[PDB]
């Protein structure tokens, strides 16, 4: 037996059902590309159940009353087990719409709405986009310029080098300020699409104006290819770093987020993910406890109060959930 919400169960980094979950996640992604948000969430939830299982699913018998495994997801798994392939899934991977939406949405600064608009307008390839520069934002132009490097998985070794230069710049701009690795890498992932960092200072308000200072230092070292500085939402910089390598260099996406220390635990929880884990945690908070959780705080809408947290553990405890360390949040 297994609980209904992903935030009530451990989901480790590696598991026994990668083929099956990958197939369901293709269907989820495709649904998202078509604006079918309900179906996206349903397939995502089913995939996450398989990630939480202790053993491989070898026979259809092994589906067992456990939640979020409706008729459609079950059929997909059945066809994979019986035939080694699911025709609905293969049709999706071969479809020009899916391939193009994946191509476009993977580019830095491009979401589903933009990608779909471009598709509707007859655009199909990266060259097609480069032929219409007036259709691109500066962020998207930078994403295109660096698309090969940004499609290359970011490695732990890259993260460690980036954390060093970010820590050096933060430390030099403001003694006392801290850098925390978040995102998938905090969850134990060996690879990723970007590197996420959360910056704060133990004295509330000393983080004001820190990020532009950190950026100036990084820029003067030749480490920045692109940055977009966004001033109650957190101050942040969406960056492409130029990471030096032996004999070469690689562009790497980095998100730098600044949070005041009072909000830090909520920010760390939100930015650590996984995306599904956080969605589930928020749905759980609202549906089961009547509280609204986000990356800034935990609000009781009836009492009009905010919960004071010193740590992620405090937040889990307040919501009546057993603590899950980040490596068990890989929903
Ligand atoms: N509050 C908030 N959270 C965000 C935002 N963008 C991303 N996140 C969250 O930050 C976490 C990390 O996001 P990603 O970097 O896309 O995903 P990841 O788990 O790090 O996966 P890889 O980067 O591919 O390793 C996830 O929980 C996201 O939901 C944002 O603008 N605001
Ligand atoms: Mn990330
Ligand atoms: Mn990110």
UniProtKB/Swiss-Prot annotation:
Miscellaneous section: DPOLM has a reduced ability to distinguish dNTP and rNTP as substrates, and elongates them on DNA primer strand with a similar efficiency. It is able to polymerize nucleotides on RNA primer strands.
Gene Ontology biological process terms, A to Z: B cell differentiation; DNA recombination; double-strand break repair via nonhomologous end joining; somatic hypermutation of immunoglobulin genes
Full protein: residues contained: 137 to 494 of 494
Cofactor or coenzyme needed: Mg(2+)
Localization per record: Nucleus
Official protein name in the record: DNA-directed DNA/RNA polymerase mu
Family: Belongs to the DNA polymerase type-X family.
Site (Responsible for the low discrimination between dNTP and rNTP) residue list: 270
Species name: Homo sapiens (Human)
UniProt function note: Gap-filling polymerase involved in repair of DNA double-strand breaks by non-homologous end joining (NHEJ). Participates in immunoglobulin (Ig) light chain gene rearrangement in V(D)J recombination.
């Amino acid at each position: 037996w297994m609980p209904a919400y992903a935030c009530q169960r451990p989901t480790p980094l590696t598991h026994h059902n990668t083929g099956l979950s990958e197939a369901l996640e293709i269907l989820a992604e495709a649904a998202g590309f078509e604006g079918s948000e309900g179906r996206l969430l349903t397939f995502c939830r089913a995939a996450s159940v398989l990630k939480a299982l202790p053993s491989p699913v070898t026979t259809l018998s092994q589906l067992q009353g456990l939640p979020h495994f409706g008729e459609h997801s079950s059929r997909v798994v059945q066809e994979l087990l019986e035939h080694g392939v699911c025709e609905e899934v293969e049709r999706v991977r071969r479809s020009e719409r899916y391939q193009t939406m994946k191509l476009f949405t993977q580019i830095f600064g491009v979401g589903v709405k933009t990608a779909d608009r471009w598709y509707r307008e007859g655009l199909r390839t990266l060259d097609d986009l480069r032929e219409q520069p007036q259709k691109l934002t500066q962020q998207q132009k930078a994403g295109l310029q660096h698309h090969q490097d940004l499609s290359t998985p970011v490695l732990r070794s890259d993260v460690d080098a980036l954390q060093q230069v970010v820590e050096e710049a933060v430390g030099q701009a403001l003694p006392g300020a801290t850098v925390t690795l978040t995102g998938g890498f905090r969850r134990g992932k060996l690879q990723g699409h970007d590197v996420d960092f959360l910056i704060t200072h133990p004295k509330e308000g000393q983080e004001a104006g820190l990020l532009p200072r950190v950026m100036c230092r990084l820029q003067d070292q030749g480490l920045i290819l692109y940055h977009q500085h966004q001033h109650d939402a957190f101050e942040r910089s969406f960056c492409i770093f130029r990471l030096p390598q032996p004999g070469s260099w690689k562009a790497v996406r980095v998100d730098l987020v600044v949070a005041p220390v009072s909000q830090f635990p909520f920010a760390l929880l939100g930015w650590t993910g996984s995306k599904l884990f956080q969605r589930e945690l928020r749905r759980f908070s609202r549906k089961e406890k009547g509280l609204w959780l986000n990356s800034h705080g935990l609000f009781d809408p009836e009492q009009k109060t905010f919960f004071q947290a010193a740590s992620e553990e405090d937040i889990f405890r307040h919501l009546g959930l057993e603590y899950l360390p980040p490596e068990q949040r890989n929903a």
